[PDB]
């Protein structure tokens, strides 16, 4: 698709068999989702946003569908204001910025 930016670029994702809404965020290196359950072991990560730093749980090699496009990669879980899909997965689904 081509998505304009007059509104927030919110899309539906699917992860662990469940649908969620998430923001396509080119300003984020990483993908971070609100508290949820994921399989396997996690590692610690600190990520920085406009307000400072938070600790999140890093899960690797997680299948996730984004607007129907299949990806498998690293998903961080922690206290984010919204689910955000960052460049690590935007690249997997072939996303570019164009003007």
Ligand X SMILES: C=CCNC(=O)[C@@H](NC(=O)[C@@](O)(CCCN(Cc1ccc(-c2cccs2)cc1)NC(=O)[C@@H](NC(=O)OC)C(C)(C)C)Cc1ccc(CC=C)cc1)C(C)C
- Residues of this chain that interact with Cl ion (CB under 5 A) are 4, 73-74, 88
Instruction: Please choose, out of 12-20, 33-41, 57-65, 84-92, the segment that lies near a copy of itself by the rule CB under 8 A.
Output: 84-92
The answer to whether residue 30 is catalytic is no
Cα dihedral value 83, 92, 3, 47, nearest 10: 30
Cβ–Cβ under 8 Å, residues 32 and 78: yes
When asked if residue 40 is in the footprint of ligand X (CB under 6 A), the reply is no
With beta carbons less than 8 A apart as the criterion, state whether 74 and 58 touch: yes
Residue placing its CB nearer to a copy of itself in the complex, 2 or 17: 2
Structure tokens at 41: 């072991």
Q: For binding to ligand X (CB under 6 A), which residues are involved? A: 23, 25, 27-30, 32, 47-50, 81-82, 84, 86
Catalytic residue positions? 25
């Amino acid at each position: 698709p081509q998505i304009t930016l007059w509104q927030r670029p919110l899309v539906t994702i699917k992860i662990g068999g469940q649908l969620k809404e998430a923001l396509l965020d080119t300003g984020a290196d990483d993908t971070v989702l609100e508290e949820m359950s994921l399989p396997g072991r996690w590692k610690p990560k600190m990520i920085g946003g406009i307000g400072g730093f938070i600790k999140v749980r890093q899960y690797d090699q997680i299948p996730i569908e984004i607007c129907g496009h299949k990806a498998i990669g690293t998903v961080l879980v922690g206290p984010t204001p919204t689910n955000v899909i960052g460049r690590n997965l935007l690249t997997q689904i072939g996303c570019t910025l164009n003007f």
